[PDB]
Amino acid sequence: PQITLWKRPLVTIRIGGQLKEALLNTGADNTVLEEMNLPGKWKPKMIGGIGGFIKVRQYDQIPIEICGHKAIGTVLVGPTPVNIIGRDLLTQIGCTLNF
Amino acid sequence: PQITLWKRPLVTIRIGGQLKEALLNTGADNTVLEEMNLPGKWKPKMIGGIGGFIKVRQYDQIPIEICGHKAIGTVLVGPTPVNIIGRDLLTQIGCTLNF
Amino acid sequence: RPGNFLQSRP
Predict the structure, then answer these.
(1) Where is this site: Cleavage (chain C)?
(2) Based on CB atoms within 10 Å of each CB, which residue in A28, A90, B20, C10 is the most buried?
């Protein structure tokens, strides 16, 4: 799609058979999801922005459907205010900014 | 034109005759610049990000040039880690997210 | 260096 920015770009995501909503965030290097149970090994990280830093868990090779586009990648999980699709996975689904 | 998201989407902006670097940010409702001096009336606001909240000053009807496109609107100024061009101005300059 | 610049209006 060519998503317009009149409203927050919230989109359907599917991960582990669960339907969720996420924000397409060109301002985020990586994808970070609200607390949830994922399979496999993980490593603690810190991620930062406005307001400071939060502790997350990093999982690798997680399949996720974003607007029906299939991606597989690193997914952080932690206390973000909203599910966020960052540039890691925006790139996989073919996203560009166009002015 | 068309911006990859393989790297941060940084563009030069011009505001009050100064050149600044800023991040095209679909995950930001508003435009938020690092601390700087602007003219005229303002109101204090609290904005949220990933790690919590910060205080900013809101200034209205400020002219900014973003990657060649003249815009005029609202600018929040405060302790953001990076200058951010949020949806309010991205919409003004015709910016869409495509994939 | 910080990397997630989510921002929400008041």
Answers:
(1) 5-6
(2) A28
Dig out the tokens for A52 from the structure: 């400071």
Tokens 């166009």 belong to residue = A98
What SS3 class is residue A91? helix
Chains A–C, number of C-beta pairs less than 8 Å apart: 41
Resolution (Å) of this entry: 1.8
Identify the domain containing residue B2 by its residue range: 1-99
Residue B68 amino acid letter:
G
Q: What is the 3-state secondary structure (H, E, C) of B41-53?
A: CCEEEEEEECCEE
Elucidation method: X-ray
Q: How many domains is chain B partitioned into structurally? A: 1
Q: What distance in Å separates the CA atoms of residue A65 and residue B70, rounded to the nearest whole number?
A: 37
- Residues in B closer than 8 angstroms to C2, CB to CB, are 81-82
Q: Least CB-CB distance to B80: which of A50, A81, A99? A: A50
Cβ atoms of B81 and C5 closer than 8 Å = yes
Judge contact between B33 and B58, C-beta under 8 A. no
Side by side, the strands of the sheet bearing A96-98 are A2-3, B96-98, A96-98, B2-3
Among the listed residues B74, B91, B80, the one whose alpha carbon sits nearest the alpha carbon of residue B38? B74
Which of A12, A10, A55, A11 minimizes the C-alpha distance to A32? A55
